[PDB]
RNA sequence: CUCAUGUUGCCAGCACGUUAUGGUGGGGACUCGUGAGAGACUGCCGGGGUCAACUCGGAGGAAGGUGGGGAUGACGUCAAGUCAUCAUGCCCCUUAUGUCCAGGGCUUCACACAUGCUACAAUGGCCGGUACAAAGGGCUGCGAUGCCGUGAGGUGGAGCGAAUCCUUUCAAAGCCGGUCUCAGUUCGGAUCGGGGUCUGCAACUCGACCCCGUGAAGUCGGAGUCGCUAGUAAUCGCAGAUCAGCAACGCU
């Protein structure tokens, strides 16, 4: 990109519901083409979640997504000796992928026989406020709360 | 009524387009009964090789040798028109089976 | 009569498009025999879903060549450029979205020294 | 594996040269070139020799070398170790 | 990694009198002794047996592991000795190269 | 290769020519049903007094040109090495470069 | 429960259960469960003895078990390695023997990866 | 995209077979296979711009700013590689380093290096049921249906120098129903002991393939590295030059 960026995809949208941050997860966890299989996965993780708190599971995904969505994040310098980390600001593109891809692969390293159940309760998890992928935001946070004395470079 | 069926091969594009104008031409000369040569497929017989001796096999090249094939259906197949078809003159880069 | 032909790599379908209800009819079968993919459903919808008239035009198929995302794709285009002989009008605003072209992005030939289109071999330096 | 329907291999040299000798009803060692000939238990009397690519082995017959090559009984590589 | 050190020793066709080993071995253990990121050693024995040498008869190339780049020294003489002390030579270029561009 | 192997291998081809004919084909043809005199044919064992050279694994496509007994395409009837002249001197009907 | 010589589990289907015998795998098993006409929809903790009892008289007659194969691998290999055949040789070596690679890989008879 | 072009392939409009079906006449209408030409040329818009190029957002379009990928290697270096594809200057063999012969080897292994695939599982293992691609190969050969074999396999040959015929009217992922219910495990398949097939005169070093039993290492990988910017990567399978049959999981 030494001569500029090409323009962002023309996404999809959901074809059920109509919010393009549903097909944004399935893409997210597709894993070797097989497009219609995670999507199944998807519709049944929903279903879970709509049959488990009377809920559109859309609204719940939203309330877990601005739990672990991030604003301030970390990016790394080698400089004079001891490579420095450095705060910056996280658009809200890269804030969206970084968050799902955190939830998801947190969810593949559960214990639920099975990744239709991982994967929602994973989602409760981190909505109602308890799961690995709000511990790893924490974690983040608390590295750039660290990290604030080296933000002048303003990079 | 009748059939007798031409199946032309060639290799020249120009040239079998060529003989199917003139063995067109001359089945019409008797005002025997002409159809035209249908637009059917051809062969690609394609061979692969590698370029220079002893090794270098990541370099390589193609090569293509087409057939290209023209089925020439004449009804009203006139004795005199027959005999007269079997006795058509052509250079040496086109073959023919007459069946 | 109205016929028109929808293509998309290898994947060609041609349709009759009568101005009944929207009864589909797909070689002897329909969009709920076939197709189990609902992705691939919203793309066969989408002119129709365009131009809100969905089920107000027949439409009968026959499917050959391709896939089915391919041949989902063909379905949709054909059926919006037979809405274009229906009546053009509409055309300049479905361009605003683009649902009648067709998609020049066909698969690759494989490339000799490699191991298939663009994945080359491990450049090893041992 | 050797197909049935064709049956064994049975090579000309030592099966006529075989008949011979058990027709003479002797016994006594006898050299051949064969590995690729198959095995009779009409050998356990013979002692029967055959070359390696440097030199020839004998080698006497037990019942259940049946079915068997003759090479199968002779050392082909040496590998005594590094 | 001591005498983790990957020798390799290789000669496509030259009459090797044992004692080459000797000398590369002991002109190899001579670098490990101060560079600690090695792994691979390949030692190369190679003869142009022309008629009327144009001062190439023997050639040697060396090439070494690395932690990211590989060291690369190749020479050429008319024995053995030479040949050897001069990569050993150029080697130690690479490698001091590469240790002043470590810190 | 050489003057002799490709000699030997033209023998080879006369040979077979000759005695596949027919003399390499009977007990083949007898000895491949269920009906076959196996059960004392000696067939098989008067097969062994043929030549090995009757059998035709010992044959091998070498070009005409050069005799490279590698590389060989049966439909040029060549080694690799002159199909790429050949068709380098446009030698040959209708061959060229193509892409797709 | 408890059989010709070894020990069934319990939450294993039939068909499954049995392939923990030397002499018997799945498609032994299947047999025998064709043969026999139970359904291999079942569990173990919920078999009867009498079809134990003639599922074991059965096997025994026509199906050589644990003991009986291990001695015929044995005397196979006595046999072969008492004839001197190469088969044998290799087996005293500790090699693959089919006519395999040797030189690198067969590490599953070279023992492990021992580095020298 | 306009016109023609009608079978060995389509088959909408029509009439006739009905167990397998375009199968047969009938329409070249859509497809279409094969050829010829228009279409992209910053073509025109208006604001920028030595007013020049160079751009910025547009219409229209199937494509729009070298449509995409291909073919194509400026002069020369690395004395790059091949005197064993081939050609050849010089030196040597000649009673032999030539040459005709059967056997053996190029597959030896206490190890090292490199390339890849098959796995460490529930997106997964197993049976059964349902639909589709492109694509090529073929004659002293490709081989169909029937039946028999567990299944590789088989007498036999219909039809075929082949848009037909062998190529199931061409597939695997996937879908529907159910089981397995997260563990050295219905994962994984090594490895061996035996029962066997085909071709080849000949399957021991040494061939591929089915079946029985066999059930090992492997519980996601180290310092660093490799490939990838779109129909790409990752995955499923097909087809084939060479080839009697094979290590082909390579190569295309």
């Given at each position: 990109p030494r001569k500029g960026p090409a323009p962002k995809r023309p996404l999809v949208n959901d074809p059920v519901y109509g919010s393009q941050l549903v097909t944004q997860l399935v893409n997210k966890v597709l894993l070797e083409g097989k497009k219609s299989l995670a999507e199944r996965i998807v519709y049944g993780a929903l279903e879970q979640a709509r049959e488990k708190t009377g809920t559109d599971p859309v609204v719940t995904l939203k309330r877990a997504l601005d739990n672990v969505k991030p604003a301030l994040e970390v990016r790394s310098r080698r400089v004079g000796g001891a490579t420095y980390q450095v705060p910056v600001e996280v658009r809200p593109d890269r804030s969206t992928t970084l968050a799902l891809r955190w939830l998801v692969n947190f969810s593949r390293q559960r214990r639920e026989k099975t990744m239709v159940e991982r994967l929602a309760n994973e989602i409760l998890d981190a909505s109602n406020g308890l799961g690995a992928s709000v511990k790893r935001r924490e974690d983040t946070h608390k590295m750039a709360e660290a990290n604030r004395a080296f933000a002048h470079y303003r990079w | 009524g009748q059939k007798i069926r031409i199946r032309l091969k060639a290799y020249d594009h120009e040239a079998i387009d060529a003989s199917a104008r003139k063995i067109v031409e001359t089945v019409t000369r008797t005002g025997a009964s002409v159809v035209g040569p249908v637009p059917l497929p051809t062969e690609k017989n394609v061979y692969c090789v590698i370029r220079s001796p002893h090794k270098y096999k990541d370099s390589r090249e193609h090569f293509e040798m087409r057939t290209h094939k023209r089925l020439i259906d004449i009804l009203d197949p006139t004795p005199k028109t027959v005999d007269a078809l079997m006795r058509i003159d052509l250079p040496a880069s086109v073959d023919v089976n007459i069946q | 009569?109205?016929?028109?032909?929808?293509?998309?790599?290898?994947?060609?379908?041609?349709?009759?498009?009568?101005?009944?209800?929207?009864?589909?009819?797909?070689?002897?079968?329909?969009?709920?025999?076939?197709?189990?993919?609902?992705?691939?459903?919203?793309?066969?919808?989408?002119?129709?879903?365009?131009?809100?008239?969905?089920?107000?035009?027949?439409?009968?198929?026959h499917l050959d060549g391709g896939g089915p995302s391919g041949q989902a794709g063909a379905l949709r285009l054909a059926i919006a450029r037979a809405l274009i002989l229906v009546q053009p009008e509409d055309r300049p605003a479905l361009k605003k979205a683009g649902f009648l072209t067709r998609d020049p992005r066909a698969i690759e030939r494989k490339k000799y020294g490699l191991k298939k289109a663009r994945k080359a071999p491990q450049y090893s330096k041992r | 594996p050797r197909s049935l329907k064709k049956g064994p291999f049975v090579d000309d040299h030592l099966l006529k040269k075989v008949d011979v000798q058990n027709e003479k009803n002797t016994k006594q060692v006898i050299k051949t070139w064969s590995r690729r000939s198959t095995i009779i238990p009409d050998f356990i009397g013979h002692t029967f020799a055959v070359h390696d690519g440097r030199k020839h082995v004998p080698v006497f017959v037990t019942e259940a070398m049946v079915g068997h090559k003759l090479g199968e009984f002779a050392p082909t590589r040496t590998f005594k170790g590094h | 990694e001591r005498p983790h050190a990957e020798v390799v020793v290789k000669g496509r066709n030259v009459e090797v009198p044992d004692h080459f080993r000797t000398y590369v071995s002991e002109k190899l253990s001579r670098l490990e002794r101060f560079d600690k990121t090695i792994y691979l050693f390949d030692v190369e024995l190679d003869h142009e047996r022309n008629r009327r040498q144009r001062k190439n008869c023997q050639?040697?190339?060396?090439?070494?592991?690395?932690?990211?780049?590989?060291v690369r020294g190749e020479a050429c003489a008319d024995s053995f000795y030479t040949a050897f002390e001069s990569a050993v030579q150029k080697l130690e270029g690479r490698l001091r190269r590469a240790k002043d561009r470590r810190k | 290769a050489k003057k002799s192997k490709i000699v030997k291998n033209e023998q080879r081809r006369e040979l077979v020519q000759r005695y596949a004919e027919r003399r390499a084909e009977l007990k083949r043809t007898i000895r491949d049903p269920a009906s076959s005199p196996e059960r004392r044919a000696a067939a098989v064992s008067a097969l062994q007094r043929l030549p090995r050279d009757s059998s035709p694994v010992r044959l091998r496509n070498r070009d005409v040109v050069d005799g490279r007994p590698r590389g060989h395409l049966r439909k040029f009837g060549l080694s690799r090495v002159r199909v790429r002249e050949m068709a380098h001197r446009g030698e040959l009907p209708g061959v060229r470069k193509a892409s797709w | 429960a408890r059989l010709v010589g070894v020990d069934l589990p319990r939450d294993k289907r039939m068909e499954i259960?049995?392939?923990?015998?030397?002499?018997?795998?799945?498609?032994?098993?299947?047999?025998?469960?064709?043969?026999?006409?139970?359904?291999?929809?079942?569990?173990?903790?919920?078999?009867?003895?009498?079809?134990?009892?003639?599922?074991?008289?059965?096997?025994?007659?026509?199906?050589?078990?644990?003991?009986?194969?291990?001695?015929?691998?044995?005397?196979?290999?006595?046999?072969?390695?008492?004839?001197?055949?190469?088969?044998?040789?290799?087996?005293?070596?500790?090699?693959?023997?089919?006519?395999?690679?040797?030189?690198?890989?067969?590490?599953?008879?070279?023992?492990?990866?021992?580095?020298?």
């Open positions: - | - | 009569p109205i016929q028109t032909v929808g293509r998309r790599k290898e994947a060609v379908v041609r349709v009759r498009l009568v101005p009944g209800t929207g009864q589909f009819n797909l070689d002897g079968r329909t969009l709920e025999n076939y197709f189990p993919n609902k992705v691939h459903q919203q793309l066969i919808k989408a002119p129709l879903v365009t131009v809100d008239r969905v089920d107000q035009f027949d439409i009968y198929a | - | 050639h040697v190339e060396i090439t070494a592991r690395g932690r990211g780049p590989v | - | 259960a049995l392939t923990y015998i030397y002499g018997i795998g799945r498609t032994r098993s299947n047999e025998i469960l064709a043969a026999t006409g139970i359904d291999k929809n079942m569990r173990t903790k919920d078999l009867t003895d009498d079809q134990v009892t003639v599922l074991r008289d059965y096997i025994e007659g026509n199906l050589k078990v644990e003991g009986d194969l291990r001695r015929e691998v044995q005397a196979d290999i006595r046999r072969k390695i008492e004839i001197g055949c190469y088969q044998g040789l290799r087996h005293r070596r500790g090699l693959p023997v089919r006519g395999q690679r040797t030189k690198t890989n067969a590490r599953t008879r070279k023992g492990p990866k021992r580095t020298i």
